[PDB]
Amino acid sequence: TIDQWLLKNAKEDAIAELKKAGITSDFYFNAINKAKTVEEVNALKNEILKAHA
Numbered sequence: 133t134i135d136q137w138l139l140k141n142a143k144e145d146a147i148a149e150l151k152k153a154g155i156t157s158d159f160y161f162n163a164i165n166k167a168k169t170v171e172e173v174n175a176l177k178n179e180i181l182k183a184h185a
Contacts, residue, residue, distance in 0.1 A: 140165060142173035155180055 143164040150161075160180045167173035 137168060139167050139169065139173065142167065142170040146173055146177060150177055155184070157184065160184065 147161055147164060157180070160176065163176055164173050167176055
């Protein structure tokens, strides 16, 4: 039982506060859904800190 996988939950609760940080790229926001859990969504955001910029 791992339907939680699909995710699609932290991508909006996180994008709603990251779009203000300035990062407006779509390569990170779109990949925010591929995340597995909330730790994977917020985790990808921490990657833009280095992977990007």
